[PDB]
Amino acid sequence: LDMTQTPASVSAAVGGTVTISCQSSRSVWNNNFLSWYQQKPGQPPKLLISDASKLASGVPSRFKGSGSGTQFTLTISDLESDDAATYYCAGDLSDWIHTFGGGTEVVVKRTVGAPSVFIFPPSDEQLKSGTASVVCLLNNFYPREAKVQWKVDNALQSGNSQESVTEQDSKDSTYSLSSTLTLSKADYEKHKVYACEVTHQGLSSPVTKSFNRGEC
Amino acid sequence: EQLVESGGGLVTPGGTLTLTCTASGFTISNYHMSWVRQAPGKGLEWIGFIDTGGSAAYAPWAKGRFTISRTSTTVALKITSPTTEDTATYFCARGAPAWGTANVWGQGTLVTVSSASTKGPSVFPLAPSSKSTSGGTAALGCLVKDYFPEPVTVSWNSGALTSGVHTFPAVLQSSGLYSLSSVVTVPSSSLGTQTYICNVNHKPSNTKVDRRVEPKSC
């Protein structure tokens, strides 16, 4: 690659330090035409540093750029919860070669926390249209990995769910996850017990939330 | 200093789309302007840039498929014969990415390359209950189902409610339509008193929906 950024992911607790590296295939222009960016979901990337070490406006001094020629480093000291983001270097390698590194995810380390679990039945409105979505919410947990198992009258459901996970929260450093089970109205109304079973490092044993179709 | 992008949206494969950026708080003709794209879940990729004289340079992969131009007040990117591989968020960025003048970027606009039709969402309640409350705290939300293309935005109580809100990334369903949920945790003792309304906007279909979410009468 013209620009090799490593590692893919780096992690520290609040107050800690993370180090991100970028190596260009040939020396960048003026030996220091290298910038660093921070990007959060739904946003354009934000310039942190240009000219290898020069802080952009509004950027705290705890973001430190160093290096020259082909070898550059971003050191983030005094890590904050709001540093949870993906970071990119960008280089000008002369000959109009402008290129980005592949990016580095920064994970803020945090005390292990179990999810709070909620299950939601399909709405009557949706059922009228012939489809039933059943939703299980896993709220505010850490670390990211979690397992959801759907059961319908104790039959394990497979291949009919999809899940989505939020970015790490900028304040409390947790994740949340939603899982959606999709059935036809006809299949939904043929069964009683709907259960969401959750496995996570913060749980000594799986947590199950359930409802009985129709019941209050 | 601000860049405002426009011109994105849905485009049929092999078609042609053009994106435009204008500037606020600075004089756009005084700068190089770059275009950068980012495919869903992927990294940043520099497409090309254009100098103050109107001379453009491109990444090797981008040549012939992208055209960058400018006027005294605008800079534009034309996408030639798009495939599904060109589906991405496109940014206009001042200068070049390594340069100190690249501190100003447009918000980014999604280009979706697809033959499929625009479709607005249905919005369903995720109602609070006994299976949805723990320790005095309940959860509720909205299921925003079956829309195309991205994006949708969700607010609660017209932006007055932000604490404890989680709006999930959309999932592409096997039907080819998107779905997402937005949830919020609230006091269970509030469920009878307080009003909770999710405000859904799907600008691609110019669809707006307000859904009030309350415990189901059972």
PDB file of C-alpha atoms in Angstrom, chain A residues 101-176:
ATOM      1  CA  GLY A 101      -4.309   5.000   5.665  1.00  0.00           C
ATOM      2  CA  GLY A 102      -6.770   2.162   6.200  1.00  0.00           C
ATOM      3  CA  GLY A 103      -7.913   3.474   9.575  1.00  0.00           C
ATOM      4  CA  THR A 104      -7.641   2.514  13.234  1.00  0.00           C
ATOM      5  CA  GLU A 105     -10.522   1.964  15.638  1.00  0.00           C
ATOM      6  CA  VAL A 106      -9.977   3.295  19.166  1.00  0.00           C
ATOM      7  CA  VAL A 107     -11.874   1.397  21.866  1.00  0.00           C
ATOM      8  CA  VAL A 108     -12.173   3.015  25.285  1.00  0.00           C
ATOM      9  CA  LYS A 109     -11.689   0.399  27.996  1.00  0.00           C
ATOM     10  CA  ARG A 110     -14.258   0.372  30.707  1.00  0.00           C
ATOM     11  CA  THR A 111     -15.512  -1.773  33.592  1.00  0.00           C
ATOM     12  CA  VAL A 112     -17.410  -4.860  32.399  1.00  0.00           C
ATOM     13  CA  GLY A 113     -21.142  -4.145  32.478  1.00  0.00           C
ATOM     14  CA  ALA A 114     -24.041  -6.500  31.801  1.00  0.00           C
ATOM     15  CA  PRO A 115     -26.830  -5.404  29.442  1.00  0.00           C
ATOM     16  CA  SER A 116     -30.308  -4.432  30.591  1.00  0.00           C
ATOM     17  CA  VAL A 117     -32.644  -6.529  28.439  1.00  0.00           C
ATOM     18  CA  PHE A 118     -36.092  -5.654  27.064  1.00  0.00           C
ATOM     19  CA  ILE A 119     -38.403  -7.593  24.721  1.00  0.00           C
ATOM     20  CA  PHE A 120     -41.131  -6.013  22.559  1.00  0.00           C
ATOM     21  CA  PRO A 121     -44.099  -7.721  20.881  1.00  0.00           C
ATOM     22  CA  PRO A 122     -45.241  -6.763  17.370  1.00  0.00           C
ATOM     23  CA  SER A 123     -47.732  -3.890  17.190  1.00  0.00           C
ATOM     24  CA  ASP A 124     -51.332  -4.534  16.193  1.00  0.00           C
ATOM     25  CA  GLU A 125     -50.784  -2.038  13.354  1.00  0.00           C
ATOM     26  CA  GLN A 126     -47.977  -4.090  11.837  1.00  0.00           C
ATOM     27  CA  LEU A 127     -49.829  -7.385  12.314  1.00  0.00           C
ATOM     28  CA  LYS A 128     -52.696  -6.071  10.174  1.00  0.00           C
ATOM     29  CA  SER A 129     -50.227  -5.857   7.281  1.00  0.00           C
ATOM     30  CA  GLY A 130     -49.315  -9.541   7.603  1.00  0.00           C
ATOM     31  CA  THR A 131     -45.853  -9.356   9.193  1.00  0.00           C
ATOM     32  CA  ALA A 132     -44.693  -9.577  12.817  1.00  0.00           C
ATOM     33  CA  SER A 133     -41.469  -8.009  14.084  1.00  0.00           C
ATOM     34  CA  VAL A 134     -40.355  -9.038  17.557  1.00  0.00           C
ATOM     35  CA  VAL A 135     -37.566  -6.902  19.010  1.00  0.00           C
ATOM     36  CA  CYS A 136     -35.048  -7.575  21.775  1.00  0.00           C
ATOM     37  CA  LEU A 137     -32.989  -4.690  23.153  1.00  0.00           C
ATOM     38  CA  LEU A 138     -29.665  -5.158  24.927  1.00  0.00           C
ATOM     39  CA  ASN A 139     -28.907  -1.824  26.537  1.00  0.00           C
ATOM     40  CA  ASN A 140     -25.697  -0.185  27.767  1.00  0.00           C
ATOM     41  CA  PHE A 141     -23.227  -3.062  28.062  1.00  0.00           C
ATOM     42  CA  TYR A 142     -19.461  -3.595  27.806  1.00  0.00           C
ATOM     43  CA  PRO A 143     -17.566  -5.196  26.096  1.00  0.00           C
ATOM     44  CA  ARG A 144     -19.085  -5.301  22.605  1.00  0.00           C
ATOM     45  CA  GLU A 145     -19.606  -9.035  22.119  1.00  0.00           C
ATOM     46  CA  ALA A 146     -23.045 -10.363  23.030  1.00  0.00           C
ATOM     47  CA  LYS A 147     -25.146 -13.319  21.917  1.00  0.00           C
ATOM     48  CA  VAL A 148     -28.914 -13.289  21.396  1.00  0.00           C
ATOM     49  CA  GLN A 149     -30.921 -16.486  20.998  1.00  0.00           C
ATOM     50  CA  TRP A 150     -34.586 -16.348  19.987  1.00  0.00           C
ATOM     51  CA  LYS A 151     -37.020 -19.004  21.160  1.00  0.00           C
ATOM     52  CA  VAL A 152     -40.646 -19.466  20.133  1.00  0.00           C
ATOM     53  CA  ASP A 153     -42.499 -22.030  22.259  1.00  0.00           C
ATOM     54  CA  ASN A 154     -38.948 -23.210  23.074  1.00  0.00           C
ATOM     55  CA  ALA A 155     -38.041 -23.778  19.423  1.00  0.00           C
ATOM     56  CA  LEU A 156     -34.695 -22.092  18.724  1.00  0.00           C
ATOM     57  CA  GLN A 157     -35.054 -19.574  15.889  1.00  0.00           C
ATOM     58  CA  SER A 158     -32.280 -19.380  13.295  1.00  0.00           C
ATOM     59  CA  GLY A 159     -31.926 -17.387  10.067  1.00  0.00           C
ATOM     60  CA  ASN A 160     -34.923 -15.135  10.711  1.00  0.00           C
ATOM     61  CA  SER A 161     -33.298 -12.446  12.856  1.00  0.00           C
ATOM     62  CA  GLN A 162     -31.043  -9.468  12.189  1.00  0.00           C
ATOM     63  CA  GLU A 163     -29.128  -7.349  14.635  1.00  0.00           C
ATOM     64  CA  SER A 164     -27.564  -3.913  14.830  1.00  0.00           C
ATOM     65  CA  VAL A 165     -25.088  -2.451  17.330  1.00  0.00           C
ATOM     66  CA  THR A 166     -24.467   1.169  18.264  1.00  0.00           C
ATOM     67  CA  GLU A 167     -21.129   2.954  18.312  1.00  0.00           C
ATOM     68  CA  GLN A 168     -19.387   3.071  21.673  1.00  0.00           C
ATOM     69  CA  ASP A 169     -21.131   5.777  23.724  1.00  0.00           C
ATOM     70  CA  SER A 170     -19.099   8.987  23.905  1.00  0.00           C
ATOM     71  CA  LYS A 171     -19.910   9.456  27.598  1.00  0.00           C
ATOM     72  CA  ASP A 172     -20.282   6.066  29.326  1.00  0.00           C
ATOM     73  CA  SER A 173     -18.327   3.934  26.815  1.00  0.00           C
ATOM     74  CA  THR A 174     -21.069   1.290  26.511  1.00  0.00           C
ATOM     75  CA  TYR A 175     -22.693  -0.421  23.538  1.00  0.00           C
ATOM     76  CA  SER A 176     -26.321  -1.232  22.847  1.00  0.00           C
TER      77      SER A 176
END
